[PDB]
């Protein structure tokens, strides 16, 4: 059961870190406006 | 070489004399509540501490202003000395020191 908890924690933190550091990567500049 | 300097490193003095002297000095009322034209003409921002406050018009001319300035300066200095010497010994005696007649309005009867 501890292995499942470790695996789920790893997956969740991976996806949340992806979300955070993707929205930190100059997101407002990705628009078609001139 | 100079006899004065800033308290916070290099290039720190930044003395702004245009705030207490001249026509742009701060008055006793904000700019919204009082225009600069209502100020007594005798108070032209020359003496220190001139906030343009004279509702009763007691400054008729320069001589009266100078006499009142002398009186005010003397009273002010005596007031600083009196306030310090009336507040400090009482606190000293109340904190645990041995002072007789600590309160200012009772030290005369001590001797």
């Amino acid at each position: 059961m501890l292995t499942l908890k470790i695996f789920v924690y790893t997956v969740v933190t991976f996806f949340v870190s992806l979300f955070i550091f993707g929205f930190l990567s100059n997101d407002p500049g990705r628009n078609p406006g001139q | 070489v100079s006899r004065s300097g800033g308290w916070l490193g290099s290039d720190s003095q930044n003395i702004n004399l245009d705030k207490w002297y001249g026509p742009d000095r701060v008055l006793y009322l904000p700019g919204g509540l009082l225009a600069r034209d209502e100020i007594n003409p005798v108070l032209n921002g020359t003496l220190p501490g001139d906030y343009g406050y004279d509702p009763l018009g007691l400054a008729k001319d320069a001589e009266t202003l100078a006499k009142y300035r002398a009186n005010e300066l003397l009273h002010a200095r005596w007031a600083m000395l009196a306030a310090a010497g009336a507040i400090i010994p009482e606190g000293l005696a109340a904190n645990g020191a041995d002072v007789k007649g600590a309160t200012w309005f009772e030290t005369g009867a001590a001797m």
Binding site: - | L8, G9, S10, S12
Partner: protein, 222 residues
């Protein structure tokens, strides 16, 4: 840039204008203008001191990481060293099981202190002779900088741009100075408290207003 030239940061903030010497012109990494004792007036002694400082910085960084690692790996992992405290880890060579790497009886299992010392003397003498002479075996590493070699010592090529190289030099020297100060702290804390560097941190975090130098040990030092 920001870290070079006459506009670089200095070690006294706004009060540092009147203390910077005329030879600390902001040409080398870590230049903050601190030469109050005037021990680097001679350019030759200045260069030797710079080499000594950088070598000390690298050694101190390695030492700090290695002093804090096995103690962290014992309380917060399943590893069981013979002794995790840095100033008590040398006595493992006299234990019945010898020195076992990571607590495993089949990883290193060193038993003799003389053989370890002899091997260390041979290897370290060879490498330090190569470094001091500026040229390794069979002419290897000739013409390279004696302090920032690069080439075979930079496999990843992180310093192939002069500006990036200068910035990384500044980062390295600042991290090294911080590590040196931290190792001095490690030494004095080991002398006074007698516990590991991590135990002191955790005990302080248990109650910061109650477990300090002043609250526990200051009055017993005189």
């Amino acid at each position: 840039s920001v870290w070079y030239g006459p506009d670089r940061p200095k070690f006294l903030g706004p009060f540092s204008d009147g203390l910077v010497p005329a030879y600390l012109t902001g040409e080398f990494p870590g230049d903050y203008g601190w030469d109050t004792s005037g021990l680097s007036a001679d350019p030759e002694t200045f260069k030797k001191y710079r080499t000594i400082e950088v070598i000390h910085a690298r050694w101190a960084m390695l030492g700090a990481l290695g002093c804090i690692f096995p103690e962290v790996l014992e309380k917060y992992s399943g590893v069981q060293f013979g002794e995790a405290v840095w100033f008590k880890a040398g006595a493992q060579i006299f234990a019945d099981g010898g020195l076992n790497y990571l607590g495993n009886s089949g990883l290193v299992h060193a038993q003799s202190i003389v053989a370890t010392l002899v091997v260390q003397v041979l290897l370290m003498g060879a490498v330090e002779i190569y470094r001091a002479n500026g040229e390794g075996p069979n002419g290897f590493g000739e013409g390279q900088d004696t302090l920032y070699p690069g080439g075979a010592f930079d496999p990843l090529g992180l310093a192939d741009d002069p500006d990036t190289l200068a910035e990384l030099k500044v980062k390295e020297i600042k991290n090294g100075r911080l590590a040196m100060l931290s190792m001095l702290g490690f030494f004095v804390q080991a002398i006074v408290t007698g516990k590991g560097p991590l135990d002191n941190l955790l005990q302080h975090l248990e109650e910061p207003g109650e477990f300090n130098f002043y609250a526990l040990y200051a009055n017993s030092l005189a």
